Symmetry: D2
Subunit: 474 residues, 4 copies
């Protein structure tokens, strides 16, 4: 068992541009709080349009033809990525601590889950860097045609606050493995580990201007990036509200390519032939992981009538024994919520559903006086048209619905806006096959949930060369 | 030898939805004209926001789960693409006539290039519908993970007038071969070729609603497809301004996937080593093929100062010799411009040149009254400053710019700020190597020009499926 | 329903070189029989080493650099293969009739599975011909490396007699797809289907010498190409024995590329949660389809202890009811065995098993004379030690073994020295999971009975260009 | 500049089986010489059939189903491969020195060329291990088909002495990356860099049995491998003579998969338009690198007539100023050849071409009295008839030919039996284009001298699941 970093000093708090730590152009600065105690952890250089323009200029310069980063061998990009999964490794405890501190998630999970995933990621695109292959194509006539992949250029990426450092690797690592330069805004709530990565980037020795980290707010720094004239790709993750704005601010900007990963509903189909103890434990980790603040995990759980009663009973025993406490105490399964705005929105929703005929089985009220702690709450007899069902609840709220027929539960889970991931627990292989093909989802988990190379195409563009040849042959 | 269809009737002028020819929901029609004779050729059922909805409902029910088009073997998706290639090949004389009248391209050229592209396209992608493979990924843990490539769904497509039937085949075939359903709006200028395809689609026996043709205007039918909420992806070719509009129309409603084929300059660098007989020719056909209406060809021609006067000589000779005249005269090389508004913006830009310093060496005015015929024109002594070299001309104008060194050209050619294509004519291998990698082009052509798999990647969606397995074993 | 061709003149009997029908350099011919009647159906030119030469030279000049078939667009090669499927779709009845009379499969099966397969193979491979893609690779330094997939060249193919026409198509589509050239020799038992193809191959119009059909014998002509100095690859399918000689015959001759398709056991595993209606029949059509003679199925059946006797019950009920007769009878499910040597080696083994403690549940002997018809037999209570469960039975013999636990049924299946396909029947997703991994099986079919054939007909060419300065 | 390890103690002289160092079962021993001086460096435990059967049981066991190496995550096999390049990097100077001493490579050459490549190779497949992907295939009907690539199993690998370590890296990394186990036999000349790698392989912590290293001889250890019954795939590299033997010694023995990396002819083609100062040197380094001892020593240099004289004039000056010396002296470009057999094989071939009309412009005899050094030789006026031009040299002899036209030289150059590799030196892009295609080569370089290494250590397992109703 590892131990949290004692008396942690937030060394790194300035803006990261051209591998220099720089003050804000205004001098302005904003505070970062501790969701467990509501206290303030420190203050960091806010970034605005002026501050963004700096970072863009740096990242364009580091992308120019004669540049170190541009001239490097692909395998030497994979080396640098691999050196940073080394530095992440030796500092695993501090990056897991500063996650625990900034982000309220239990320090043991932040170590064995989050940081773990940051390192494997970096290692994995480390290996991809020099295995990104174009093709050669037979073309009617005396021609030879072939295809290079090449970096797109300056990418600005905006990440939410659910998984601050994991989002960070998830986005840096493909971007760099393809040879791009980067301008990343971590959420305003959780910039801290992001900034610590900046020193680790200098330390593994990426060329300057290749990774630039600007902490600050959606309206200021975020909107700066989303509309900047000198950024080629923007990749954003968060609320479908703010997502809409990015896409329009990008066709009225420079037509920059745009990636949007937005939340979705995550239905959770449990047929009766499943191991009830397994499923009650998986569906409880599938809703209660990272205190429900999991953009990859959901809350709509469809239990088959046969096992509906017993399931609820099992799940409510799980929540009632589910330790909520200080993130740094190693027996805590569930930390606070990220901030008060989130805390309120979930309560307002719990009391919403309690006022539409949902049987509150437990929870449904805050925990402490200080912090943002919410009792793990379970709801029963949720109908499709309850508000609580139509809108995903980004906290520790388990909503158990009922179903009796397979095609029923399929059309129900199916109906949905854009965005949807599905999870089924069955042993009938025919049941798994029909359902997983029928779900209009992009990810489907047969008997599990979790938090690759398709991520690479979306950081490169295809250049096509065709040469005329004297006499074509087989 | 092949001769235009005589007494050609325009049998197909209604709206194509659900494999029924249909009238406007408003009763209204719109004119279509013969750019050669200026004469109105017929009148077509104009489409608007409600016609669009008709075809979106068609195209959403035919993509539904039980659907014939969904159950179909992917191998049979390709059989229909081959049966349609059959029909096109059968009616290759009628199609090339229709394209030549309503579009203005010479008939022989519509028969031996355009139409040859159409048929080759459908046979190509008939071969792909079988071969769209997903992948199996090894993952850490006791898990089995694979991907499926599944159709995106209802695809609104908006093609222009440059190559009416070709652009129709280049957009429709990849989306079909991936299992999609289409709402395609052909140019208001040139919709007769695409309406006649509906009749061949019915005869090949696509399930109704799997393709729907809606002729109309950009502002009515164009934007109607762009904002319509039951269209999962939109694919547009044409003006850079219209496309920025679409990207906003698409963020504001539905957040659809959006694809913008948008024009640009196409620098031609003809280094001195080249074979001048070939280069004067390949650079003359690159400019005047399809009378200048080419978003897959260019107007800037860069010649090394060594061979400048000899080049502008041989160029003006070929442009003096170049044969204008009716599309059906089998001696015509260049036909008319598509309609008056273009014909006028081309002469506008010719007079722009003469009043800024261009050495007009040939042509520069209209030919007569009949139709929209413009003389073949060659400019000279052009700089990058001039407004004829900073904005592209969509007509039969050949401008020729000077250069001296090679790193000189590589800079001047990249200066669009946006995405283009390049061409290079060299016997030296390292020039060819150097310039082709130095270009910011989507495609480079070495010792040629021209008017695959990678169009396919944009017409399906990846689904992932991780199964929990009872033990991992290599 | 479709009907066999009434007047089946076997027009095509000569050897095929350079798209010319030719006679034996020796003049010698050989017989071709009808296993339904034991009657003799015609006499076909017998091929030997001197016929294999000329044939190898045909293909050699058809593949030489400045050639039509070489300079061709790959897409045209696609068009050619695609035209072939047309003619086979046209003469479907003809070629199902000729396949039924000569090889003895029921003509309805010939028309609806074999010919189904052939036509689809040529179409699938018409579609590959022009999508065979190479590779640009990032390489340290100022360089630029790419890859071309290029044909191998002259390819000797040696196909068996189980699915004569299908096997002919499975072996020729990919090779010609990649732009190879073929000297194929079909089983002496069944040259007839293949010599017809030669007509259509010309009618569609492949360049002369791009395909070359060779009728004759394994030792006479099969070794002629197996050891032939001017052949680049050899493509054998047959017994585990005859291939070992091919593999050695190569190492001593040319260092040809050698692929060997060799028959192996197909164990079925029917756990007791399986649909017994489906299982007893799907494992009855895996054992008895094509009169047992299957290089894509097998005879060992492992049924769970709980569902054991009820299985073999429903199975003997299916094998008694299984109609046997003339292949042209729209009722016949099983036709004859391929020849008398085959006939005997079957009955020899069915007498082997009765003599070893295997309850002969059904069948066991012949049917009548003038033809090679064996009763559908069923064995129960077959151990692993019995010589009929150790050795392949190439006939209508369904032996059923017992098993009590899953790790037990998985240990018995894998026990086989060479290749193997396995077929599982279970609704337990996790049982399916473990069995299909644990099998050391090439193919695994859960609840039933492409490109990786393309990569065998091409070699890789790699070109690195030195460049002036490298940039992303 | 780095400095060779001083007074290197060859510490690792024993067989490597099961991550334990063992003596030979017979207890026999063989010696290892220094090709620069001819003095024996040390002795090594000789491996034979007895030893190979320990090796093959240890690796078959490492491959068993519940083994560490099999339940390991793919990405972990890549982690292991990454520690091994780490350790090679840590020991770059001892491995380079072992190589310089055992194999006679100039020490800086081992250090910046060979060891660079060992390390990069291990790093590169270290990234491949968990990116080895299968397929999901659309299939006619209510079905779901997909592909998983899986290790073949125990692979016995045999390597030459040209590039002892480099050939070890290149052979083992792709094998390991796919999750196999190995039985590798270094050349008897040059086991030493290999046997050290056993210590490194134990260090990084590969499970036992996954890598067993047997030093000894072709007829004993190597033959005991190719024929073994417990080996699933034989991977040989060297003379096409022993090559042929191993393909036959693997027909007569479990029909195991064979891979043969045998020498071949490597023509150079210098067109007049090229940069003569580049071309003369890249052609010089193409011949004399590693003392002519390349897998395909680029022996034939066709030079277009217009530059022919001036090319050979500058060539002879380059060969005359080439420093043949002690491998440990940092000014050395050319070392000794591997042993006397190779040595006088070369002297006899030089005496051949002199006796047939080739104008020996420099070189032709040995160097000192001790060791196996040979003057860098260069021949003029060589013709395709001469034996030295028809048969491959494995040493420092450059043979320069004339040519007139492009199609002449193209026709001349791919006039090889089997293998060929080609290099063109030209600025004419069309010439480069036509030559590189019309070359019957497998690798073609323009203006100079991976995953196509993976599929070969996997096999595709196919699974087809029946589904209730397929939608797209």
């Amino acid at each position: 068992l590892p131990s949290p970093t004692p008396n942690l000093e937030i060394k790194y708090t300035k803006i990261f541009i051209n591998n220099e730590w720089q003050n804000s152009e205004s001098g302005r600065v904003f505070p970062v709080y501790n969701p467990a105690t509501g206290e303030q952890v420190c203050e960091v250089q806010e970034a605005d349009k002026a501050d963004i323009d700096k970072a863009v200029q740096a990242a364009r310069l580091a992308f120019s033809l004669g540049s170190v980063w541009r001239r490097m061998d692909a395998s030497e990009r994979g080396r640098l990525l691999d050196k940073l999964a080394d530095l992440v490794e030796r500092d695993r405890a501090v990056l897991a601590t500063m996650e625990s501190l900034n982000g309220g998630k239990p320090f043991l999970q932040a170590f064995y889950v989050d940081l773990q995933g940051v390192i494997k990621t970096f290692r994995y695109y480390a290996g991809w860097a020099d295995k990104i292959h174009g093709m050669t194509i037979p073309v009617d006539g005396d021609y030879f045609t072939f295809t290079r992949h090449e970096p797109i250029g300056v990418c600005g990426q905006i990440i939410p606050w659910n998984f601050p450092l994991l989002m960070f690797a998830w986005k840096i690592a493909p971007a760099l493995c393809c040879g791009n330069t980067v301008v990343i805004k971590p959420a305003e709530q959780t910039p801290l580990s992001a900034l610590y990565m900046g020193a680790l980037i200098k330390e593994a020795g990426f060329p300057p201007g290749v990774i630039n980290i600007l902490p600050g707010y959606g309206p200021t720094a975020g909107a700066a990036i989303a509309s900047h004239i000198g950024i080629d790709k923007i990749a954003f993750t968060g609320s479908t509200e703010v997502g809409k704005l990015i896409q329009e601010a990008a066709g009225r900007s420079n037509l920059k390519r745009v990636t949007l990963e937005l939340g979705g509903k995550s239905p959770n189909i449990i047929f009766a032939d499943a191991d009830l103890d397994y499923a009650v434990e998986q569906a409880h980790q599938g809703v209660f992981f990272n205190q429900g603040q999991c953009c990859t995990a959901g809350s709509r759980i469809f239990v088959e009538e046969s096992i509906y009663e017993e399931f609820v009973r099992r799940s409510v025993e799980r929540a009632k024994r589910r330790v909520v406490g200080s993130p740094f105490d190693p027996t805590t399964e569930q930390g606070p919520q990220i901030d008060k705005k989130q805390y309120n929105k979930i309560l307002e929703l719990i009391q919403s559903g309690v006022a539409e005929g949902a049987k509150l089985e437990c929870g449904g009220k805050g925990l402490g006086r200080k912090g943002f702690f919410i009792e793990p709450t379970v709801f029963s007899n949720v109908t499709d048209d309850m508000r609580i069902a139509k809108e995903e609840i980004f906290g520790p709220v388990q909503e158990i619905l009922r179903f009796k027929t397979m095609d029923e539960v399929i059309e129900r889970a199916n109906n949905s806006d854009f965005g949807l991931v599905a999870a089924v627990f069955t042993n009938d292989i025919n049941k798994a096959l029909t359902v997983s093909s029928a779900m209009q989802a992009g990810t489907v988990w047969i008997n599990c949930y979790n938090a690759g190379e398709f991520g690479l195409r979306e950081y490169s563009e295809v250049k096509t060369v065709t040469v005329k040849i004297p006499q074509k042959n087989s």
